[PDB]
Write a protein that binds this ligand. Sequence first.
Ligand SMILES: CCCCCCCO[C@H]1O[C@H](CO)[C@@H](O)[C@H](O)[C@@H]1O
Length: 158
Amino acid sequence: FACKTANGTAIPIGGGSANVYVNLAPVVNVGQNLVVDLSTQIFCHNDYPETITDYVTLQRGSAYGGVLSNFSGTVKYSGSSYPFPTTSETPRVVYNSRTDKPWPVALYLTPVSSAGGVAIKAGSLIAVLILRQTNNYNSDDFQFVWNIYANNDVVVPT
Ligand SMILES: CCCCCCCO[C@H]1O[C@H](CO)[C@@H](O)[C@H](O)[C@@H]1O
C-alpha cells in the first residue's frame, strides 16, 4: 500500500509524510463553503490485492492558521460528514485494487461570523490529515501524513 499526490510526490510502503499544495477559491462569503477536495489530490493503491485487503481511515484531521481561526469545518469521508477538526477516527475504506483510487476526503469550510479580510494566507499550513492504513494480512499499522498548504490568499468580504 502506498500513496501519491497529483504532482507525483509519493509516500511509500510503511508510511511517511508529504506536502500537498492546493488552490483555493479566492473569495468566500459568510454563508458559503470553501471546498478543499483532496480526492483530486491524493491517490492510493493496494500492492497485493491478490491476497491482501487494505483498510484506510482518516485517523484524524487538524486545522491550522486561518482555517482554525476563521472557519467552521466539516470533513466528508467517502460520502459521510463529520466535524473538522475531527473528534473520532472514521470508518474504514477498502483498498482492494492495484489501480490508483482517490482518497475520498473533502473539507467544507464556512467562514465564522468574526471572519473578514484575508482569512487564509498564501503559503500557510491550513490542515494536517492523517491517513491510517491497516490490512487483513499482518500487523501493519501505518500513518500517511498529509500536510496541506494554501497556494493563495482567501478573502472573506466585509
Ligand atoms: C509473498 C508475500 C508478499 C507480501 C507482500 C506484502 C506487501 O505489503 C505492502 O502492501 C500490502 C498491500 O497493499 C499492505 O497491506 C502492506 O501494509 C504493505 O504496504
